[PDB]
Amino acid sequence: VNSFSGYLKLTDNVYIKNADIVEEAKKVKPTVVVNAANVYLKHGGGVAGALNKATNNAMQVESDDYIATNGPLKVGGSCVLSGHNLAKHCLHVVGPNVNKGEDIQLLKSAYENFNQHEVLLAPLLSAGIFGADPIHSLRVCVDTVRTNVYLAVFDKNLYDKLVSSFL
Numbered sequence: 016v017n018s019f020s021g022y023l024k025l026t027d028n029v030y031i032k033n034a035d036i037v038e039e040a041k042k043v044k045p046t047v048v049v050n051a052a053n054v055y056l057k058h059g060g061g062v063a064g065a066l067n068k069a070t071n072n073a074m075q076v077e078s079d080d081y082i083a084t085n086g087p088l089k090v091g092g093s094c095v096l097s098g099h100n101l102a103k104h105c106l107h108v109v110g111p112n113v114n115k116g117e118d119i120q121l122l123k124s125a126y127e128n129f130n131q132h133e134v135l136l137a138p139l140l141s142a143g144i145f146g147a148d149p150i151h152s153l154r155v156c157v158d159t160v161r162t163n164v165y166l167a168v169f170d171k172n173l174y175d176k177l178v179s180s181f182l
């Protein structure tokens with residue numbers, strides 16, 4: 016039993032809710048919140064900008080030190096950093112950004128990072144300002160992630176479409 020509330024169950028291990036991931040993280044304090052990161056960990060907008068704003072920019076400060084030491088992530092890759100006031104840990108995962116021309120096949124590699132964590136609160140990777148079809152992202156999630164994932168979808172209209180079209 017865990018504290019996630021109000022989710023629709025899609026499969027054995029994937030759950031979905033119309034929610035603001037920032038507000039959901041603030042209430043649940045999950046072990047892991049996933050950030051929709053880029054390779055530079057520049058948290059300017061979308062989910063990343065919102066998560067970073069909620070940490071009062073502490074996420075960005077920590078991320079800049081990470082990059083200065085380690086260099087950029089790979090598209091499809093991830094790193095574990097602090098969850099600050101939102102979660103124990105933040106798993107920064109880089110899905111391909113279609114608006115930069117990155118290969119959508121890398122979306123499966125991106126979701127594979129979730130399998131290193133037993134339970135996660137997450138957005139749909141490569142959705143929103145990353146330009147991919149969220150219906151496709153949900154399909155890849157379900158077919159790739161084997162651990163327990165709680166997906167927060169900010170847009171109510173999109174949430175209803177994802178549910179109604181789910182196979």
Ligand SMILES: Cc1ccc([C@@H]2C[C@@H](C)CCN2C(=O)c2ncnc3[nH]ccc23)o1
Nearest residue numbers: 036061062065142143149167168169170173
């Ligand atoms: C066109 C459009 C607008 C928004 C989005 C994306 C994808 C859709 C499918 C879900 C919501 N989205 C997020 O990025 C998101 N999700 C959860 N919590 C968030 N908090 C701040 C942003 C945010 O796409």
